[PDB]
Design a binder for this molecule. Structure first.
Ligand code: FAD
Ligand code: FAD
Lengths: 473, 473
């Protein structure tokens, strides 16, 4: 629940053509794009939407919370629906997959009620997102025909759509489900591990990489998180390649590189790939298939835009085109495309891949590049860190230690990334670093940056300042 | 006590100069400056310090916490002392006021142990700070010659030095002190009002301005804080000029131009003014008497610097010279003056007057200009505000509303200030805006800034993004 009127971008419509705008996909990106277009230019344009799913505007980010019983039910996991979009002026086709696009005649063909539906367009917006990847695992295959990623082996699950989360939660009811294996230690696999453990199941987290949250946090924080999970009953099996998921009629064992585990359910959280096949090669693609787009979210074909997990985005930390699959980027890229497709020139500004994670009371946040990542990409990076209490030691209650890492370029001196971890929520602080990187602020300028002081809130020489002042080179 | 090794600014000694450097004053500004010089350039320079007080390196910021018994006395309110500074390499003179400066023979004269002591210098750093403001009030006079702001009338108090607090606490135990009047409704007056209230005394907060926290927060938030204090029995008497403090040998009643109040003690917290008497008309001063300094904290007299509360500072919100008496600025100007004084070219970057306040569980933070203040300064400013919960509606516990205000220039579009209030600590969020104002970020660019999303921490359409998108002007 977060609605409003027009944005500060909304521009007076004058001397511009009216446009029929077709949107393919209506989840985070599509919904954000559609709402901005309608609430800002309303009747000026004709918005037609197609989504192959039976539901839209779902919050996948809330699936772990729901499975782990951290929230009552799935009610609040939807931020819009067909009726709401239509009440804004959109024409919406549910369970209608667009199956081909003719860029010359400017029409899309979608399967509406078992029949081919041709829809003309002036502007086309791709918000088709992505789909989960199936690693080469014996016993793991998908049932042909389903757009819901159903596994052939009972109790082997994928976790992307609402149905997937509902499916898992139903099965968890079965008293036989006692041991669950989660494959993939990225942020999704980690949250799911906590979720299943929170449901009382024995959990084993498997990944071929040597730690969890690889690429988002440095060694000491991924170690802290791993420790966090272990001390909660989650068994860690890092550095192991899954070979097979076996079982007679259902999941009964998961076999890896270095071991075998008796489990009653397997969850695959290894990654996703963008849905850009509708491009038919006509559109330039990023190395991973994502639609390549500029700062206005426009593809190599004029009039055709791409947003969210199906397209790329500019990364101000690496300072190159990149692919960052986050609902946060979906919302913002959707807003940008909305204005541009409606005739308002709006240049996006890139992102930093800012993220947060909260598992069993361990709170962390990061933005930009970790020291490992920065180095691995040829940056002459260094890190300055500091661990200290949030408030002055004389504060009798509510104090706590915070660990902060500030990764910067030894050469250019600009901040490349930052990470924070604490047993209390200090996430609001990562916003500063997100902006820092965006603006190219250096470790030297940060050190003297005005960070207020109030003993009730912080120390005169807070950890941000101490970290920056303590940088070397 | 927040010690550390060398800063990232430390420049390797090459053909530079070693100097005899005299520092006048050793509270927040002097201490920070002396430590930076000695820790970064040790033996190269000769540091001599003079302070007229019997205690140095005190955290005046904790006085209300101390008085209101929120902490264990003043045990943690000192961040250094004579022996510490001497061990770092400085010669320290306590209870030794500097009475005159000979800018020609570059020497200062201090009253040491009663006799006159002369000290020559290559560089001079003024850190004489400020003194409380004392408007024309009958019966309110500081005893001639006291260096501790002692009022001639018994039970009329100032709250600036360590002694002033111990003095109030001393008289506070007097079972006869029942009603206490606090003159000045700025953050210090509000904090002291709460302190005396916690001591079970009846408090009446008087100020000429018709509101509390004038210039720090806009009317709806100051209304919030006013109602907050009244919720705890504090009486408010705004829009009144204190004309006289009267009584038979002691305080018995305070009279304004509109009313009269029967009180047993009066605390004057009208504000502070720079202590720049030692300038002797030889140094350029700012409109309020503060030593006018440049980006390097150097005065109009080469070789002479001024830091903290006795000097000006550059304000990036107004984009001009200004006076902002805060420990945060005291510390930073000290660091900059120290390096430049020791031969390292270091240009300060200005501040935003960022601040915070926490009273009876109401936490507020602001930075830069309020709409009313921006306008009082001639800016064609506008504000965009928003109120929503910190997290998604489906969050079981730990959720709370937050009100945010972003003030911006309707013409240049750059952010001028920002305010936030909630009953849960969101103070970390103001750092982003302080940095945003520093970097001249526009309201349009702010709206697309990469604000991460995690249901446990915030909403996809968080209030920062919503308020920004909501810019109307
Ligand atoms: C468990 C989990 C937790 C997550 N947590 C967070 C988090 O805490 N914070 C964060 O920022 N992000 C999080 N994410 C990521 C976020 O959910 C995605 O980045 C976001 O959903 C992408 O939105 P989208 O609209 O681009 O694409 P998608 O959500 O992939 O949606 C694409 C839509 O288009 C439709 N579609 C596809 N092809 C066609 C077609 N051919 N014709 C018609 N319709 C079509 C699909 O049915 C779908 O509705 C999480 C994801 C998961 C799975
Ligand atoms: C009740 C209260 C609450 C506050 N709360 C906050 C807060 O929460 N956050 C924040 O950022 N700031 C706060 N402040 C402001 C902060 O305390 C000041 O900004 C800071 O102390 C200024 O440090 P300074 O060294 O520049 O000056 P001062 O503290 O004024 O010290 C100047 C020093 O120089 C000495 N001196 C002066 N003249 C001479 C002389 N002629 N010869 C020799 N020595 C001399 C004095 O004895 C003194 O020790 C608060 C202040 C008060 C009083």
């Amino acid at each position: 629940g977060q609605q409003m009127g027009r944005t500060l971008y909304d521009d007076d419509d004058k001397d511009r053509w009216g446009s029929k705008i077709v949107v393919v996909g209506a989840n985070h990106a599509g919904t954000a794009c559609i709402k901005t277009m309608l609430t800002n230019y309303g009747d000026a344009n004709e918005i037609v939407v197609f989504d192959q799913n039976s539901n839209i505007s779902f919050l996948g980010s809330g699936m772990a919370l729901w499975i782990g019983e951290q929230i009552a039910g799935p009610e609040g996991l939807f931020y819009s629906d067909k009726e709401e979009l239509e009440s804004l002026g959109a024409k919406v086709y549910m369970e209608s997959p667009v199956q081909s696009i003719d860029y010359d005649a400017k029409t899309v063909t979608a399967l509406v009620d078992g029949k081919n539906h041709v829809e003309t367009y002036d502007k086309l917006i791709f918000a088709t997102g992505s789909q989960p990847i199936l690693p080469p695992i014996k016993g793991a295959e998908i049932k042909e025909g389903s757009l819901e990623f159903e596994a052939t082996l009972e109790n082997l699950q994928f976790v992307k759509l609402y149905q997937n989360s509902a499916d898992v939660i139903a099965k968890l009811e079965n008293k036989d489900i006692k041991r669950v294996a989660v494959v993939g230690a990225g942020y999704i696999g980690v949250e799911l591990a906590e979720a299943f453990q929170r449901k009382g199941k024995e959990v084993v987290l498997i990944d071929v990489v040597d730690t969890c949250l690889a690429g988002y946090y440095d060694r000491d924080l991924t170690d802290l998180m791993a420790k966090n999970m272990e001390e909660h009953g989650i068994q860690l099996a890092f550095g192991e390649t899954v070979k097979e998921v076996a079982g007679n009629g259902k999941v009964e064992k998961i076999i890896t590189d270095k071991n075998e585990y008796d489990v009653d359910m397997v969850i695959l959280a290894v990654g996703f790939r963008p849905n850009t096949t509708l491009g038919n090669g006509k559109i330039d693609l990023f190395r991973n298939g994502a639609f390549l787009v500029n700062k206005r979210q426009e593809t190599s074909i004029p009039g055709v835009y791409a947003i969210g997990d199906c397209a790329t985005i500019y990364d101000n930390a690496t300072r190159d085109t990149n692919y960052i699959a986050l609902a946060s980027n979906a919302v913002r890229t959707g807003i940008v495309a909305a204005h541009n497709a409606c005739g308002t020139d709006l240049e996006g500004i890139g992102v930093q891949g800012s993220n947060g994670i909260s598992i069993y009371g361990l709170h962390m946040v990061s933005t930009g590049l970790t020291l490992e990542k920065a180095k691995r990409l040829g940056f002459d990076a260094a890190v300055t860190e500091y661990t200290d209490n949030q408030k002055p030691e004389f504060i009798e209650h509510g104090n706590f230690p915070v660990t902060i890492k500030i990764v910067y370029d030894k050469d250019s001196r600009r901040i490349l990334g930052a990470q924070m971890a604490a047993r209390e929520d200090v996430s609001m602080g990562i916003h500063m670093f997100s902006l820092a990187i965006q603006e190219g602020v250096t470790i030297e300028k940060l050190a003297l940056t005005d960070i207020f002081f109030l003993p009730h809130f912080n120390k005169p020489y807070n950890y941000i300042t101490m970290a920056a002042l303590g940088a070397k080179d």
